[PDB]
Nucleic acid binder design. Structure first.
Ligand code: NA
Ligand code: NA
Length: 327
DNA sequence: CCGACGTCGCATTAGC
DNA sequence: GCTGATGCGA
DNA sequence: GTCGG
């Protein structure tokens, strides 16, 4: 299934989704439109009617209506109107700044702050996160080619090992699945000395090292288990600079690591099926552990996990490579 | 018909 | 000050 | 907004 097949419908729903999240502050309506957008995006025929589309899981009466209006007129009256609305369109746009959500965007627009120019005119009213989001607004919306991800991984793995050779790091996300580009870099970190029953600087030391070699350029948030920040590859001599990229690093206990690696490798749809599989085998998987039920439904103790495949073994499924984890 | 819809670490601010 | 709720991103 | 108990 291609773009031109139902792109006008999926773009319509995605737009509606964004206005729900950012303007109406209705997070569940936001997800509902997206779920409709997703299932339609995968549908292998040019939709002829709203009724045809309503058969799909996630498409109800209201979206079937909108599809019927779109097909007949090439537009949606409500979407046209809200696009044209200065207040709403500005609130929606401002949320594209990292750190500016629906609430902060509303306040800015309430007091006349509506554009990037206005934001740059009013730094004093931005928190640390939002200034960074403003500074790298364009960079953060770019894709990351796999070649650059590999170069970034080279640096991360190298420096992590230099701090302590007993560290274990894994770049997860769609990168580990072999996607040809990424939205960011998600790093999962662990150490033999850090377990569930179980220093307060295991993560700090790694962040500090990546900063010393000037890979990590900025910090959005930093605690004892989770770092969120900005990084950049070294300029390849006299050539143009690389865009700044978003990078997350999390420290996970050794006994929860591969459950963490499994979850943050994805995809969402794969994860959902593997948690459905799964319960029907009498197990419950979260991002941290896998646990047995339990005849009356009571969750028992977390089972020991020493690899990804270990989780598969518990639930009667053969191990599937991240390359094959789209669903 | 009416509640669920993912969950949580971190930054920031509320109320006291 | 401290205790907790909220916003945000993922 | 959609699903389902
Ligand atoms: Na449906
Ligand atoms: Na934002």
């Amino acid at each position: 299934p291609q773009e031109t097949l139902n792109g006008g419908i999926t773009d319509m729903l995605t737009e509606l989704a964004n206005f729900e999240k950012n303007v109406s502050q209705a997070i569940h309506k936001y997800n509902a439109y997206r779920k409709a957008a997703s299932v339609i995006a995968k549908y292998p025929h040019k939709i002829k009617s709203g009724a045809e589309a309503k058969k799909l899981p996630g498409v109800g009466t209201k979206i079937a209506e909108k599809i019927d209006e779109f097909l007949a007129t090439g537009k949606l009256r409500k979407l046209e109107k809200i696009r044209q609305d200065d207040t709403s369109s500005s609130i929606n746009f401002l949320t594209r700044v990292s750190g500016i959500g629906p609430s902060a965007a509303r306040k800015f627009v309430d007091e006349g702050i509506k554009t990037l120019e206005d934001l740059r005119k009013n730094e004093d009213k931005l928190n640390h996160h939002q200034r960074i989001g403003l500074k790298y607004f364009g960079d953060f919306e770019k894709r990351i080619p796999r070649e650059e991800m590999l170069q970034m991984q080279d640096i991360v793995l190298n420096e992590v090992k230099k701090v302590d050779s007993e560290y274990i790091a894994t770049v997860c996300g769609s990168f580990r699945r072999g996607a040809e580009s990424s939205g960011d870099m998600d790093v999962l970190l662990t150490h033999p000395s850090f377990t569930s029953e179980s220093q307060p600087k295991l993560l700090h030391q790694v962040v500090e090292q990546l900063q010393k070699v000037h890979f990590i350029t900025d910090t959005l948030s930093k605690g004892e288990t989770k770092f969120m920040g900005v990084c950049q590859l070294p300029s390849k001599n006299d050539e143009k600079e690389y865009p700044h990229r978003r990078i997350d690093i999390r420290l996970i206990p050794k006994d929860q690591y591969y459950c963490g690696v499994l979850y943050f490798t994805g995809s969402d749809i794969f994860n959902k099926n593997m948690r459905a599989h799964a319960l029907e085998k009498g197990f419950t998987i979260n991002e941290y552990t896998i646990r047995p039920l339990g005849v009356t439904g009571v969750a028992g103790e977390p089972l020991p996990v020493d690899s990804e495949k270990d989780i598969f073994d518990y639930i009667q499924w053969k191990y599937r490579e991240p390359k094959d984890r789209s669903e």
